[PDB]
Amino acid sequence: NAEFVTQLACKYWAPHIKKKSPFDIKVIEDIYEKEIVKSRFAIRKIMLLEFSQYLENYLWMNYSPEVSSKAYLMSICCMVNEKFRENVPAWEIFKKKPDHFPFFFKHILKAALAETDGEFSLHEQTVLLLFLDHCFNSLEVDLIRSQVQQLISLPMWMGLQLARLELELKKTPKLRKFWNLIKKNDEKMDPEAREQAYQERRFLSQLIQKFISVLKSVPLSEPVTMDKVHYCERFIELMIDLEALLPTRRWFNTILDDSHLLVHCYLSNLVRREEDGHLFSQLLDMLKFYTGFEINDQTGNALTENEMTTIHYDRITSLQRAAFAHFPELYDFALSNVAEVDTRESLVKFFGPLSSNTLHQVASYLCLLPTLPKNEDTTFDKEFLLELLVSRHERRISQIQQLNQMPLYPTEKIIWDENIVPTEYYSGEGCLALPKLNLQFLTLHDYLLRNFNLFRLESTYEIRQDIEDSVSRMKPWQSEYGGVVFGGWARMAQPIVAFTVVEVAKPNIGENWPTRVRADVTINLNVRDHIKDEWEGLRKHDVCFLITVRPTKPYGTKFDRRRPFIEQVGLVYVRGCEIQGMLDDKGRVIEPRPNLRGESRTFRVFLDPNQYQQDMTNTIQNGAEDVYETFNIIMRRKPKENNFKAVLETIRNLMNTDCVVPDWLHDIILGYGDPSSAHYSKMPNQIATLDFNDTFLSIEHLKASFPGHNVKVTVEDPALQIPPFRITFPVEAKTLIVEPHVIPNRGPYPYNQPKRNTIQFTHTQIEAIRAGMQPGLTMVVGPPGTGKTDVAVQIISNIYHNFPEQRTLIVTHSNQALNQLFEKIMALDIDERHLLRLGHGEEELETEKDFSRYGRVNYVLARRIELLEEVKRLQKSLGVPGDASYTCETAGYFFLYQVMSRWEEYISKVKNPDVTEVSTFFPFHEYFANAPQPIFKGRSYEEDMEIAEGCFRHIKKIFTQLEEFRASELLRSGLDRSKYLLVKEAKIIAMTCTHAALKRHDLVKLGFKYDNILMEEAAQILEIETFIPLLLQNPQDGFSRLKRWIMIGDHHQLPPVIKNMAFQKYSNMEQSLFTRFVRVGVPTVDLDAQGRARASLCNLYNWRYKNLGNLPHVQLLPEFSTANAGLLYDFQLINVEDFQGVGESEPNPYFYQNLGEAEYVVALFMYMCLLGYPADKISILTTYNGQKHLIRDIINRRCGNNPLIGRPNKVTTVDRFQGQQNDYILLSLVRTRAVGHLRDVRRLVVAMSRARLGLYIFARVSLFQNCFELTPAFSQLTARPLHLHIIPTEPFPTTRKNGERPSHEVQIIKNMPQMANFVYNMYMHLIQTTHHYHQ
Ligand SMILES: Nc1ncnc2c1ncn2[C@@H]1O[C@H](COP(=O)(O)OP(=O)(O)NP(=O)(O)O)[C@@H](O)[C@H]1O
């Protein structure tokens, strides 16, 4: 009935249909019963409804109390849930018309609590659970928060057992007055508002009771309906989210404990079902982590180890009090020391023999259960009563100890578990046992652990793929007797020839695992030399996997990749390892690498010590076979895709340090508290006066840079009002005091005057630069081409000059951004000896100078030589004898003894007074003879004195550098020399976030220090990889040394790449820290003037940003108003219908293509080349890799060996063209059936902004027009014709302007075949009339 739902849409609510039939309630009733319910809530049906804008255009705007029904409530929830599943904005229509939302919300609550199997089915109530989960996860929306407040505030405690309430009020006496105040205010309520309030206050506690009864209805072994299982799963998901968010946890945690839900769940039949309850069990483990989480519910602070111990000791103590006073059977227990009774074992020993009635009575004295009336039997099971008391009082290991016992490698028990390692096929219909990233975290441990686990589990997916491919290729077959033979070979995996554990070291004190486990693994490189080289290319810290297969198939049996991998190859074990090094023929671990002989190679590796202990324990205790005698395959990976273990290790070490981040950052990082509290205007150490140096080009530029301020200059003469400028900021209060000042003379060589900034920064860019110079958090949102890089280097330059004792860390996502920063840095007044760039390569040098450790060591060495030669020349100019050359050491002696002495004597004469005596007594005439003469001008004392001063500064700089360079005389190796630059010499240190994550351990060990962090591409960087650069150093006197945090990025462009999008769908793992901070509400500086593309093209994406306009040169330069030759419009959206009955096609699954679009795009590219376009100035983009390869295929098969037709600079996907651009972009959107991942507006914005001068898009226009999120772009694109307007008699280039009517014929191409015809005829006319000649 796809034609049914669509016809309804067209009639009643579809977009781009002028007139619709009026609202009819029966449409909602019919669609819900016959389309949604009858199809068993089929996802495709729900998608069609959601995409057709059912919620926005029919459901909500026609919703009222008078028309509300079951079908109406459910339909709204289905649409909202689907929007979450599709990651599109879910709440906008409610925000638009909020009036009836409170009524709607209250009735969702009623429906959720409705009697099981009653009016609402269990599935329908699961849908409601999920919807409510989304609500609780969305308290940032005022409309939702105002409804949810009453469900989760202190008054909810009226759902507590009366004795437990009193216990809590006694525990926190200050709570009682607030409790009383609530009871008083309740009196002022009318009877219905009171009843509504009480129902809301009891909702969650009553919901728990409903769950418990559903859970109990699950049989132990008999068949169970999946609807019960899924209800229970979604319920625990709700519990976790409520518990993992402080505002929802604060009062509800006590409620959850009072209900004893967790004990019910662990004793339940459902968890005991190994297959059915597996997901439920994993969700349960997550909930347990949070119900026992180490945080104070009221203060929100993390609990110390002492506080934990006290809590545990107080519980035992109160149990012993009750034991002593009321239970003779527990006399011995009550008198015993805590340690002797508080283990699970001891507690079972003491309470296990007791009757059900006695245990119930014990629990009642702890306010855990109601009193058991005299002579009554308890209704609770003994195992419940026992587990209640035992679990509550047993010793717990801390969160840290729990973390420190986790293996860092996935085993075969994890890699194929799709509850925690979902495939890319994950629809989003079921839930996963995964952490979620949103806005807030409980504590730093919570924050770090969520990222740890998400990184861990996501990386495991890629490992699965690598294992399945390489091991399948090896074709493991059975041989005789019962052995394995490999029918194939693999590049990335080899048969193990030998394996031996060679070291099991003793545990550190306390820890129960070996500190180190090592093994030797031998392979036989009976392979192609290319493969032999790659295997010998393994290096220290490279991670490999050790695999055990016991093949199931006879020899020759075909493998099917579609079938379950484990049964296919007989997968038994997977263990990870880390290369220490390859052995040489002297038995030494290789760190002048040798040429080994033969084809056998042995590697010494590290095994995960926690995994080793667990396996050994399993072997010793349970007779399990020794896993480490069974490995027969070893697999290596691509190094660039294989950093997971090192990142996890870094994150775990962080969790084991005190994590000292700035106190003004901690709360914001965790996502709570005032988001603006780290803004410079609110920092207590805000600096009043700043030197802006070369930031402003003139006093006019400065005045224009502060629109809302009154500028007062300390000097009236307009000729003295030139840069550099100091600016003092107040604390009338809109007044800026500007002081012009003079750069100190640097010597008699005018070329040694400093380089200067040439960028006339806008007032907005100035706000960013100003903020970056101040202490605190500075966030800059920089739309495409708004000058992010110029802002960055100006901030860096200003910090460099203002605070010469501070060090700046630069972190980016890509090496391209680093290349751009260093390029612009080179044009500014920054000494290259203070620059350093870290990286793992073997990276192509793209800048004019080399800023790697290697390049910088070399510069220092070469500069030292030149400077020591200057000292020699100085020596001789002074008439000091001595033929020996200087070292940095003797140069230092020379400066103090020969230079400073002469200068001090000189200053004593002329600065303690004629113009003539400035020059007459100047001690360095001969040294500066080579400089432009005369040195002194003889005009005034002040002038010549400063000229003399500058000469001394020149000489002093020589010796300052040599003193810095002495280290290269004390450190011979390039590695030690590079260490000196990193720890001491450099003032600006740059690297990628990737490198920062890998190298944090080494950096901390080196004593790396820095004061300021600047980041670019911030919204492209994963959350945890944004956090790690905050901690590349040790704390200083107990506090973070970090003074500034500047982040520059664009959350309206593409996010960090998540290989497996299931982790985005469920967990929002792609969300950057930058993006989270913007969402949290951290104030941002939004750059508002782009300078790389036409204003006309900018309109296609500037709607997405705050006030994004264009820079003057874009508005005024001819190059932006000159039309594109042979094309009427500078941009067009071109409709492409079917070609030979096909639209989108899929030759391989998910390898989306569109022959009609591809052929049209290539034909246009050919058309342009035949017009004389620079083929290199054209790049071709598409949203799918399948189409990319197809366009390439057609490029080679249609252009081929054509002299008149070049190649486009690139043929690639939009996602691979981030930060890149060309003059002309040809874009293919491919899809005809469904919109696909272009619905992500960020992908849209990137796609709309890759072109400087020309953008031509080929798509099924109708499909994308219907997409609500894409409307602001496509409503602009459809304002122009959807048939390509060509002007084939106008060659490239043209002087025709953008607006003027063309002086040639305009022909309209109405489809691709007509175009492919035209281009063929045009070319056959050009082959006859011309002849070009490349060979
Ligand atoms: N205030 C300004 N006045 C004049 N030109 C500017 C100004 N700000 C930036 N530009 C220039 O405008 C051009 C576009 O900036 P650009 O470097 O490409 O943007 P970006 O934010 O740094 N990176 P991207 O978004 O990928 O293009 C550059 O040549 C800049 O130098």
Ligand SMILES: [Mg+2]
């Ligand atoms: Mg809001």
Ligand SMILES: [Mg+2]
């Ligand atoms: Mg850039």
